[PDB]
Design a protein around this motif. Structure first.
Motif, PDB file in Angstrom:
ATOM      1  N   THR A  98       0.667  -1.181   0.294  1.00  0.00           N
ATOM      2  CA  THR A  98       0.134   0.090  -0.188  1.00  0.00           C
ATOM      3  C   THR A  98       0.785   1.435   0.029  1.00  0.00           C
ATOM      4  N   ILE A  99       1.734   1.393   1.019  1.00  0.00           N
ATOM      5  CA  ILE A  99       2.441   2.679   0.928  1.00  0.00           C
ATOM      6  C   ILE A  99       3.316   2.739  -0.222  1.00  0.00           C
ATOM      7  N   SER A 100       3.962   1.716  -0.893  1.00  0.00           N
ATOM      8  CA  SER A 100       4.521   1.614  -2.074  1.00  0.00           C
ATOM      9  C   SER A 100       3.847   2.432  -3.082  1.00  0.00           C
ATOM     10  N   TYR A 101       2.491   2.481  -3.404  1.00  0.00           N
ATOM     11  CA  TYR A 101       1.853   3.326  -4.298  1.00  0.00           C
ATOM     12  C   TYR A 101       1.337   4.737  -3.534  1.00  0.00           C
ATOM     13  N   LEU A 102       1.123   4.677  -2.146  1.00  0.00           N
ATOM     14  CA  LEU A 102       0.476   5.932  -1.593  1.00  0.00           C
ATOM     15  C   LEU A 102       1.659   7.051  -1.652  1.00  0.00           C
ATOM     16  N   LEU A 103       2.672   6.892  -1.202  1.00  0.00           N
ATOM     17  CA  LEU A 103       3.686   7.883  -0.933  1.00  0.00           C
ATOM     18  C   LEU A 103       3.769   8.574  -2.330  1.00  0.00           C
ATOM     19  N   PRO A 104       4.187   8.032  -3.489  1.00  0.00           N
ATOM     20  CA  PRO A 104       4.217   8.590  -4.927  1.00  0.00           C
ATOM     21  C   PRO A 104       2.935   9.180  -5.258  1.00  0.00           C
ATOM     22  N   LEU A 105       1.945   8.754  -4.807  1.00  0.00           N
ATOM     23  CA  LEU A 105       0.676   9.040  -5.285  1.00  0.00           C
ATOM     24  C   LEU A 105       0.406  10.480  -4.488  1.00  0.00           C
ATOM     25  N   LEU A 106       0.634  10.746  -3.258  1.00  0.00           N
ATOM     26  CA  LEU A 106       0.602  11.869  -2.479  1.00  0.00           C
ATOM     27  C   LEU A 106       1.397  12.822  -3.146  1.00  0.00           C
ATOM     28  N   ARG A 107       2.592  12.551  -3.144  1.00  0.00           N
ATOM     29  CA  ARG A 107       3.645  13.468  -3.944  1.00  0.00           C
ATOM     30  C   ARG A 107       2.978  13.983  -5.200  1.00  0.00           C
ATOM     31  N   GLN A 108       2.562  13.108  -6.132  1.00  0.00           N
ATOM     32  CA  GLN A 108       2.029  13.654  -7.235  1.00  0.00           C
ATOM     33  C   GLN A 108       0.931  14.573  -7.418  1.00  0.00           C
ATOM     34  N   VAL A 109      -0.219  14.227  -6.258  1.00  0.00           N
ATOM     35  CA  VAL A 109      -1.314  15.095  -6.383  1.00  0.00           C
ATOM     36  C   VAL A 109      -0.910  16.445  -5.656  1.00  0.00           C
ATOM     37  N   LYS A 110       0.019  16.476  -4.585  1.00  0.00           N
ATOM     38  CA  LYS A 110       0.604  17.490  -3.994  1.00  0.00           C
ATOM     39  C   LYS A 110       1.192  18.621  -4.775  1.00  0.00           C
ATOM     40  N   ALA A 111       1.730  18.040  -5.823  1.00  0.00           N
ATOM     41  CA  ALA A 111       2.519  19.062  -6.803  1.00  0.00           C
ATOM     42  C   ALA A 111       1.552  19.760  -8.037  1.00  0.00           C
ATOM     43  N   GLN A 112       0.372  19.129  -8.187  1.00  0.00           N
ATOM     44  CA  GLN A 112      -0.663  19.689  -9.155  1.00  0.00           C
ATOM     45  C   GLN A 112      -1.019  20.974  -8.633  1.00  0.00           C
ATOM     46  N   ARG A 113      -1.468  21.820  -9.325  1.00  0.00           N
ATOM     47  CA  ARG A 113      -2.015  23.025  -8.933  1.00  0.00           C
ATOM     48  C   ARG A 113      -3.644  22.631  -8.105  1.00  0.00           C
ATOM     49  N   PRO A 114      -4.113  23.475  -7.153  1.00  0.00           N
ATOM     50  CA  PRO A 114      -5.358  22.955  -6.433  1.00  0.00           C
ATOM     51  C   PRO A 114      -6.650  22.893  -7.302  1.00  0.00           C
ATOM     52  N   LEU A 115      -7.447  22.000  -7.201  1.00  0.00           N
ATOM     53  CA  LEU A 115      -9.033  21.841  -7.678  1.00  0.00           C
ATOM     54  C   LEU A 115      -9.474  23.539  -7.683  1.00  0.00           C
TER      55      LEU A 115
END
Lengths: 444, 25, 188
Positions: A97-114
RNA sequence: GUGUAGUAUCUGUUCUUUUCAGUGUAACAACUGAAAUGACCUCGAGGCUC
RNA sequence: UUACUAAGUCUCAUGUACUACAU
């Protein structure tokens, strides 16, 4: 006209990037025999600090995950953080689970807000059961808790729809869902309560189960509303044909990561060992082995040693004791190497005597017996030496003569042998093996 | 300071008529 | 799928059953006597058992299965004043180890005098009324009262910082002192 | 003792956009359209609330 | 002393009959 976005957030640490290829192969073998397929796979990491996560996150994780990175984590974390599509085959409870969560968190964080008119999500995780979705979402929240810029909503069946609609009203950066409910929510009210336009990252966990529980149509339709340059990872304990076929359809240049699917050594090879206490005893065993073999009479053997000096010595030793060998090593002129190789391939029941380093490339047919006279010190060398006897149904036997002091050698044997191979041998030899291996292991 | 430790009928209830709360006056 | 168990017919007049519920009626079909549901195959029977329907009927069936020396002490009233208003203070004195020498068996001996505000609406004579009394009581001695015409005096507002040992009431803890060593009860 | 098309009937399973307005209905159901966002109080309920 | 009523829709499976049509 799609909006461009960043998917590679991985900065390889210097200590990792210094590793050679042989080093990387060895690390994978030691990590429960990690197997990769695909081009350009980043090297596995062995420490949470090699991933460049803030101190907050570090504290939090540790807290979140206790002890060493698992094999799946070691390899999947840098591959996913690098933005690659990934197929990850490993058991439940491997920490995937953390194997994909960490990178996912990072990727979403970097995008402009909704924006004020955007529903989200940016990240989508699909699970086949309500119970798994809830579990994944609980993980997510342990990360979204600190950071109020990121929400997750869990959308499953066997649960009030209206309740989840109230959430999704407020917009959400992450959705965790079962496929049916998600599709139901997408289509609902002209699809005006949930958009797929900002999804850049899709995870499908226990992917084999999704086909098992009839979700092919739903997950297929979902991937059709998602931009095809999305990052997608598929995690599953098994790799059924349905999943294999699905991955080809939804992934680009995937890296597949399989943890100890099969044994490091071919399962038809019979691995054995004998623990000795002096070089002399090792030599006594080596001779007993060579004679004993005759009562079972092609049938040829290879003794592997660790050095050219040892090879010469043992050659003369074996000679003085009535045993003729075809000795081979790189200090010998190539012309005499050829003479010995041909003599070996010629004479019936011949014995080759060879340095471990030449094992991978030996130009001889598979043999019935490998005697490793000096316990090898790497997993890669153990595979190449023992593999000299590997032959599907006609595989023979590899035996290591190990010395009491050879702790790392015992560690390798304990990791590469089948449990039932260690059982059939003397329970005291077996016990010494495990003690030797444990001592080496705590030695680090 | 001083916090020391030691050592289901979903469609059925709508069908029943609870889509519109009824009242006896 | 039957696991080799023998389910007797309903009419065979009942060996202990696994579940004493699923039976076979006069016909060959299988039935749940509680649920009154017919089932074609043992697989359908197992679907029935694993179904919420049967369980609800099991819970319903379980619910069916359950179905004084009176001595006037000496008070010392005195008009007080602080800041920002006016309050009353009373100084009640008690015996000087004169009669309390015969009773010392830790029977509420640790209990200090108690005060309460009583409305004159209730009296042994019930003649006139309409005012309050600040009654003060101690086990042996006789009760004492003090008339309070003023609707409110010294009725403060959060004097201390809300600490909760109710004792008897907010009145007693809030504004009373019991000098037990000298036997002097102050109230204000 | 088979195959093509197709049908009916059990049982299991499960509750679909919180609301509003119209159609519809014996009332339902069902169908048709839209969509709040924010703040606060007491024990999912409640507001002559803004 | 318990004053007598529960399944419905959907989904994905199982149970069982059947109807035209061909060897």
């Amino acid at each position: 006209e799609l909006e461009p976005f960043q998917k590679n957030f991985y900065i390889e640490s210097e200590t990792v990037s210094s590793m050679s290829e042989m080093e990387v192969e060895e690390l994978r073998l030691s990590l429960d025999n990690i197997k990769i397929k695909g081009t350009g796979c980043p090297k596995p990491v062995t420490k949470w600090s090699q991933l460049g996560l803030s101190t907050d996150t570090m504290v939090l994780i540790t807290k979140l995950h206790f002890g060493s990175l698992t094999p799946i984590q070691s390899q999947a974390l840098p591959a996913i953080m690098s933005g690659r599509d990934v197929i990850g085959i490993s058991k439940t409870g491997s920490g995937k689970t953390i194997s994909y969560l960490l990178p996912l968190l990072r990727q979403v964080k970097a995008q402009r807000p909704l924006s004020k008119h955007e529903t989200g999500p940016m990240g989508l995780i699909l699970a086949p059961t309500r119970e798994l979705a809830l579990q994944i979402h609980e993980e997510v929240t342990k990360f979204t808790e600190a950071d109020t810029s990121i929400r997750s909503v869990c959308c499953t069946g066997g649960s009030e729809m209206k309740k989840q609609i109230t959430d999704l009203k407020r917009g959400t950066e992450i959705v965790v869902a079962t496929p049916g409910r998600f599709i139901d929510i997408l289509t609902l009210n002209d699809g005006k309560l949930l958009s797929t336009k900002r999804i850049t990252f899709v995870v499908m966990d226990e992917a084999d189960r999704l086909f098992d529980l009839g979700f092919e149509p739903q997950i297929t339709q979902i991937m059709k509303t998602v931009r095809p340059d999305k990052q997608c990872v598929l995690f599953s304990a098994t790799f059924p044909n349905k999943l294999r076929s699905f991955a080809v359809r939804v992934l680009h240049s995937p890296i597949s990561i399989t943890i100890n699917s099969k044994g490091m050594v071919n399962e038809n090879v019979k691995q054995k060992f004998r623990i000795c206490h002096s070089e002399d005893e090792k030599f006594d065993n080596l001779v007993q082995l060579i004679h004993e073999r005759s009562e079972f009479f092609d049938a040829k053997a290879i003794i592997f040693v660790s050095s050219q000096n040892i090879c010469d010595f043992i050659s003369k030793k074996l000679l003085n004791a009535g045993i003729v060998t075809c000795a081979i090593h790189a200090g010998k002129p190539y012309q005499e190497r050829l003479m010995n190789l041909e003599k070996f391939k010629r004479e019936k029941n011949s014995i080759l005597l060879c340095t471990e380093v030449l094992s991978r490339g030996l130009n001889v047919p598979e043999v019935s017996l490998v005697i490793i006279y000096n316990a090898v010190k790497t997993f890669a060398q153990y595979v190449h030496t023992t593999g000299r006897t590997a032959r599907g149904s006609r595989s023979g036997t590899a035996i290591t003569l190990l010395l009491h002091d050879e702790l790392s050698g015992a560690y390798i044997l304990s990791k590469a042998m089948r449990d039932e191979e260690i059982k059939a041998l003397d329970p005291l030899q077996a016990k010494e093996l495990q003690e030797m291996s444990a001592k080496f292991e705590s030695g680090m | 300071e001083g916090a020391e430790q030691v050592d289901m009928p979903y469609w059925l209830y709508k069908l029943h008529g609870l889509d519109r709360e009824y009242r006896c006056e | 799928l039957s696991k080799g168990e023998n389910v007797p017919y309903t009419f065979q007049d009942e060996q202990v059953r696994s579940n004493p519920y699923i039976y076979k009626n006069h016909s060959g079909k299988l039935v749940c006597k509680l649920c009154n549901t017919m089932h074609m195959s043992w697989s359908s029977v197992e679907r029935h058992l694993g179904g919420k329907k049967h369980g609800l009927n099991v819970l319903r069936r379980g619910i069916s299965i359950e179905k004084x020396x009176x001595x006037x002490x000496x008070x010392x009233x005195x008009x007080x004043x602080x800041x920002g208003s006016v309050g009353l203070a009373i100084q009640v004195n008690y015996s000087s180890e004169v009669k309390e020498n015969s009773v010392d068996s830790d029977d509420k001996a640790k209990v200090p005098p108690l005060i309460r505000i009583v409305s004159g609406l209730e009296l042994s004579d019930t003649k006139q009324k309409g005012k309050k009394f600040l009654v003060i009581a101690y086990e042996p001695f006789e009760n004492i009262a003090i008339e309070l015409p003023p609707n409110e005096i010294l009725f403060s507002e959060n004097n201390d910082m809300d600490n909760n040992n109710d004792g008897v009431d907010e009145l007693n803890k809030k504004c009373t002192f019991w000098d037990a060593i000298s036997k002097l009860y102050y109230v204000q």
